[PDB]
PDB file of all heavy atoms in Angstrom:
ATOM      1  N   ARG E 260      27.756   7.372  31.626  1.00  0.00           N
ATOM      2  CA  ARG E 260      28.931   6.553  31.507  1.00  0.00           C
ATOM      3  C   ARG E 260      30.040   7.285  30.732  1.00  0.00           C
ATOM      4  O   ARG E 260      31.215   7.190  31.086  1.00  0.00           O
ATOM      5  CB  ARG E 260      28.518   5.295  30.700  1.00  0.00           C
ATOM      6  CG  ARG E 260      29.532   4.147  30.547  1.00  0.00           C
ATOM      7  CD  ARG E 260      29.013   3.210  29.431  1.00  0.00           C
ATOM      8  NE  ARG E 260      27.636   2.918  29.535  1.00  0.00           N
ATOM      9  CZ  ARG E 260      26.746   2.848  28.578  1.00  0.00           C
ATOM     10  NH1 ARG E 260      27.163   2.927  27.286  1.00  0.00           N
ATOM     11  NH2 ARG E 260      25.454   2.639  28.829  1.00  0.00           N
ATOM     12  N   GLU E 261      29.636   7.972  29.655  1.00  0.00           N
ATOM     13  CA  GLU E 261      30.634   8.588  28.762  1.00  0.00           C
ATOM     14  C   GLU E 261      30.855  10.052  29.040  1.00  0.00           C
ATOM     15  O   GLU E 261      31.768  10.639  28.409  1.00  0.00           O
ATOM     16  CB  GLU E 261      30.214   8.319  27.300  1.00  0.00           C
ATOM     17  CG  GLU E 261      29.967   6.879  26.962  1.00  0.00           C
ATOM     18  CD  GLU E 261      29.741   6.631  25.499  1.00  0.00           C
ATOM     19  OE1 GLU E 261      29.746   7.582  24.736  1.00  0.00           O
ATOM     20  OE2 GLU E 261      29.597   5.423  25.097  1.00  0.00           O
ATOM     21  N   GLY E 262      30.083  10.619  29.932  1.00  0.00           N
ATOM     22  CA  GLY E 262      30.111  12.081  30.249  1.00  0.00           C
ATOM     23  C   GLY E 262      29.739  12.840  28.968  1.00  0.00           C
ATOM     24  O   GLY E 262      30.407  13.805  28.575  1.00  0.00           O
ATOM     25  N   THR E 263      28.638  12.355  28.349  1.00  0.00           N
ATOM     26  CA  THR E 263      28.179  12.966  27.075  1.00  0.00           C
ATOM     27  C   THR E 263      27.662  14.371  27.238  1.00  0.00           C
ATOM     28  O   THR E 263      27.770  15.206  26.306  1.00  0.00           O
ATOM     29  CB  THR E 263      27.028  12.101  26.506  1.00  0.00           C
ATOM     30  OG1 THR E 263      27.531  10.785  26.343  1.00  0.00           O
ATOM     31  CG2 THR E 263      26.571  12.665  25.181  1.00  0.00           C
ATOM     32  N   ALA E 264      27.056  14.637  28.400  1.00  0.00           N
ATOM     33  CA  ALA E 264      26.518  15.954  28.766  1.00  0.00           C
ATOM     34  C   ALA E 264      26.528  15.967  30.324  1.00  0.00           C
ATOM     35  O   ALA E 264      26.740  14.935  30.925  1.00  0.00           O
ATOM     36  CB  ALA E 264      25.070  16.080  28.279  1.00  0.00           C
ATOM     37  N   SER E 265      26.291  17.118  30.889  1.00  0.00           N
ATOM     38  CA  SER E 265      26.278  17.227  32.354  1.00  0.00           C
ATOM     39  C   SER E 265      24.906  17.457  32.899  1.00  0.00           C
ATOM     40  O   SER E 265      24.687  17.472  34.133  1.00  0.00           O
ATOM     41  CB  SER E 265      27.250  18.290  32.850  1.00  0.00           C
ATOM     42  OG  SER E 265      27.140  19.514  32.024  1.00  0.00           O
ATOM     43  N   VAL E 266      23.912  17.708  31.993  1.00  0.00           N
ATOM     44  CA  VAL E 266      22.590  17.999  32.353  1.00  0.00           C
ATOM     45  C   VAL E 266      21.603  17.215  31.404  1.00  0.00           C
ATOM     46  O   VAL E 266      21.961  17.071  30.239  1.00  0.00           O
ATOM     47  CB  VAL E 266      22.314  19.561  32.222  1.00  0.00           C
ATOM     48  CG1 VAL E 266      20.800  19.870  32.401  1.00  0.00           C
ATOM     49  CG2 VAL E 266      23.097  20.409  33.352  1.00  0.00           C
ATOM     50  N   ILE E 267      20.460  16.727  31.974  1.00  0.00           N
ATOM     51  CA  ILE E 267      19.433  16.035  31.048  1.00  0.00           C
ATOM     52  C   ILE E 267      18.192  16.931  30.933  1.00  0.00           C
ATOM     53  O   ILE E 267      17.611  17.410  31.950  1.00  0.00           O
ATOM     54  CB  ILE E 267      19.045  14.626  31.555  1.00  0.00           C
ATOM     55  CG1 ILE E 267      20.221  13.620  31.753  1.00  0.00           C
ATOM     56  CG2 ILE E 267      18.067  13.935  30.530  1.00  0.00           C
ATOM     57  CD1 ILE E 267      21.099  13.496  30.545  1.00  0.00           C
ATOM     58  N   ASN E 268      17.826  17.240  29.669  1.00  0.00           N
ATOM     59  CA  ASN E 268      16.575  17.921  29.423  1.00  0.00           C
ATOM     60  C   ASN E 268      15.473  16.899  29.266  1.00  0.00           C
ATOM     61  O   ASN E 268      15.490  16.215  28.213  1.00  0.00           O
ATOM     62  CB  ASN E 268      16.640  18.721  28.119  1.00  0.00           C
ATOM     63  CG  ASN E 268      15.448  19.685  27.945  1.00  0.00           C
ATOM     64  OD1 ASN E 268      14.525  19.661  28.749  1.00  0.00           O
ATOM     65  ND2 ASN E 268      15.503  20.539  26.908  1.00  0.00           N
ATOM     66  N   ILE E 269      14.645  16.749  30.295  1.00  0.00           N
ATOM     67  CA  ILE E 269      13.529  15.816  30.205  1.00  0.00           C
ATOM     68  C   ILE E 269      12.366  16.371  29.374  1.00  0.00           C
ATOM     69  O   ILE E 269      11.903  17.509  29.661  1.00  0.00           O
ATOM     70  CB  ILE E 269      13.009  15.418  31.664  1.00  0.00           C
ATOM     71  CG1 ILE E 269      13.971  14.447  32.295  1.00  0.00           C
ATOM     72  CG2 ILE E 269      11.622  14.788  31.648  1.00  0.00           C
ATOM     73  CD1 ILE E 269      14.737  15.166  33.449  1.00  0.00           C
ATOM     74  N   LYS E 270      11.992  15.666  28.377  1.00  0.00           N
ATOM     75  CA  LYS E 270      10.811  16.024  27.588  1.00  0.00           C
ATOM     76  C   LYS E 270       9.887  14.830  27.596  1.00  0.00           C
ATOM     77  O   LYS E 270      10.095  13.884  26.833  1.00  0.00           O
ATOM     78  CB  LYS E 270      11.098  16.393  26.154  1.00  0.00           C
ATOM     79  CG  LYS E 270      11.937  17.708  26.114  1.00  0.00           C
ATOM     80  CD  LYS E 270      11.770  18.381  24.834  1.00  0.00           C
ATOM     81  CE  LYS E 270      12.704  19.630  24.865  1.00  0.00           C
ATOM     82  NZ  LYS E 270      12.666  20.308  23.540  1.00  0.00           N
ATOM     83  N   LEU E 271       8.793  14.910  28.422  1.00  0.00           N
ATOM     84  CA  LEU E 271       7.954  13.750  28.559  1.00  0.00           C
ATOM     85  C   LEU E 271       7.299  13.378  27.231  1.00  0.00           C
ATOM     86  O   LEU E 271       7.115  12.144  26.961  1.00  0.00           O
ATOM     87  CB  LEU E 271       6.845  13.987  29.635  1.00  0.00           C
ATOM     88  CG  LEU E 271       7.341  14.251  31.003  1.00  0.00           C
ATOM     89  CD1 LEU E 271       6.188  14.490  31.930  1.00  0.00           C
ATOM     90  CD2 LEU E 271       8.186  13.086  31.525  1.00  0.00           C
ATOM     91  N   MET E 272       7.115  14.313  26.313  1.00  0.00           N
ATOM     92  CA  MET E 272       6.572  14.054  24.954  1.00  0.00           C
ATOM     93  C   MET E 272       7.432  13.142  24.119  1.00  0.00           C
ATOM     94  O   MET E 272       6.932  12.490  23.147  1.00  0.00           O
ATOM     95  CB  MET E 272       6.316  15.336  24.195  1.00  0.00           C
ATOM     96  CG  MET E 272       5.254  15.214  23.176  1.00  0.00           C
ATOM     97  SD  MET E 272       3.656  14.762  23.929  1.00  0.00           S
ATOM     98  CE  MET E 272       3.442  15.949  25.276  1.00  0.00           C
ATOM     99  N   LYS E 273       8.726  13.104  24.429  1.00  0.00           N
ATOM    100  CA  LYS E 273       9.654  12.335  23.633  1.00  0.00           C
ATOM    101  C   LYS E 273       9.903  10.886  24.139  1.00  0.00           C
ATOM    102  O   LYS E 273      10.175  10.034  23.381  1.00  0.00           O
ATOM    103  CB  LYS E 273      10.998  13.114  23.478  1.00  0.00           C
ATOM    104  CG  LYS E 273      10.887  14.157  22.359  1.00  0.00           C
ATOM    105  CD  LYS E 273      10.827  13.528  20.978  1.00  0.00           C
ATOM    106  CE  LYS E 273      10.686  14.637  19.888  1.00  0.00           C
ATOM    107  NZ  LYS E 273      10.868  14.101  18.499  1.00  0.00           N
ATOM    108  N   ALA E 274       9.691  10.663  25.422  1.00  0.00           N
ATOM    109  CA  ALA E 274       9.942   9.322  26.015  1.00  0.00           C
ATOM    110  C   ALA E 274       8.679   8.670  26.622  1.00  0.00           C
ATOM    111  O   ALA E 274       8.639   7.462  26.803  1.00  0.00           O
ATOM    112  CB  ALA E 274      10.975   9.462  27.101  1.00  0.00           C
TER     113      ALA E 274
END
Side-chain angles (χ1 to χ4, degrees):
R260 190 194 317 141
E261 306 188 357
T263 303
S265 42
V266 171
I267 306 303
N268 193 353
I269 286 111
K270 293 207 186 175
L271 299 177
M272 208 60 52
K273 281 289 177 169

